[PDB]
Amino acid sequence: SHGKQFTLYTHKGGPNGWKVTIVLEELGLTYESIFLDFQKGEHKAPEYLKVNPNGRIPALIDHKNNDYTVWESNAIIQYLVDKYDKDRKVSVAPGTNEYYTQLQWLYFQASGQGPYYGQAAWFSVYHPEKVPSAIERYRNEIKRVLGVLESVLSKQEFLVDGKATVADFSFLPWNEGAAKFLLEGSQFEEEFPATAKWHKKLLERPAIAKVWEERAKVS
């Protein structure tokens, strides 16, 4: 209905739709973003459940692949680079050892960064009572995850050693949350300097900077 290769179901504020948008833009692909209104329950409405039965964003429909539909941000991202980064600008080749190292880092992001950072967000902002021990638990886990990244990034430039890939990009949106709200003050920058430098440089890439400007705009 719109002349773009993809329909992307997303959200204006949350990190995970922007994660996919970063990759779409890095790959030079066209997309129509449908921003769901969570306050109106649109992500739980039958119209969206037929797209993603989990009732969460993002979800992607590829109109140049017979409307193939896939959800989970990092599954979407793998689909996008495997099919549409054949020049390997921001990904490694399927069927190589490095591919499974890329995949390892993408799972660490999706299972180790996102959910735990998200529980810090939950207890700090949304939970109906203030539970300092829960807030502290998840802040400490954010710092533990950052420490893992720091242990690697202090010794090599990027996660899949030689070049920036979607494995690196996948951590950006949630780490921007750590930088701006989930940790107090400048703790991200001063406690994890190698990670903070890597993060900053990725955000300055032209496609990522473009997406981040758009995120600020739609807000």
Ligand X SMILES: N[C@@H](CCC(=O)N[C@@H](CS)C(=O)NCC(=O)O)C(=O)O
CA dist., res. 112 & res. 107, Å (int):
7
Cβ of residue 46: shortest distance to ligand X, in angstroms? 15
Q: Which of 35, 112, 158, 187 binds its own copies (CB under 8 A)?
A: 112
Check residue 197 for interaction with its own copies (CB under 8 A). no
Stretch that binds ligand X, among 22-30, 68-76, 78-86, 188-196 (CB under 6 A): 68-76
Q: Scanning residues 149 to 208, which ones bind ligand X (CB under 6 A)?
A: none
Among ligand X, its own copies, none, the one that 28 touches (CB under a kind-dependent 5 to 8 A) is none
Give the angle subtended at the CA of 126 by the CAs of 135 and 203, to the nearest 5°.
75
6 and 32 in contact (C-beta within 8 Å)?
yes
Alpha carbon of 7 to those of 49, 61, 148, 182, 208: distances in Å? 15, 5, 35, 30, 19
Q: Which is nearer to ligand X, 99 or 112 (CB)?
A: 112
For the stretch 39-70, what's the b/e string if a residue is b when 16 or more beta carbons lie within 10 angstroms of its beta carbon?
eeebbeeeebeebbeeebbbbbbbbeeeeebb
Among its own copies, ligand X, none, the one that 11 touches (CB under a kind-dependent 5 to 8 A) is ligand X
Q: Which is nearer to ligand X, 147 or 193 (CB)?
A: 147
Identify the CA nearest to 6 among candidates 16, 25, 19, 15.
25
Q: Which is nearer to its own copies, 90 or 106 (CB)?
A: 106
Cβ of residue 200: shortest distance to ligand X, in angstroms? 22
Q: Which of 4, 12, 63, 137 binds its own copies (CB under 8 A)?
A: 137
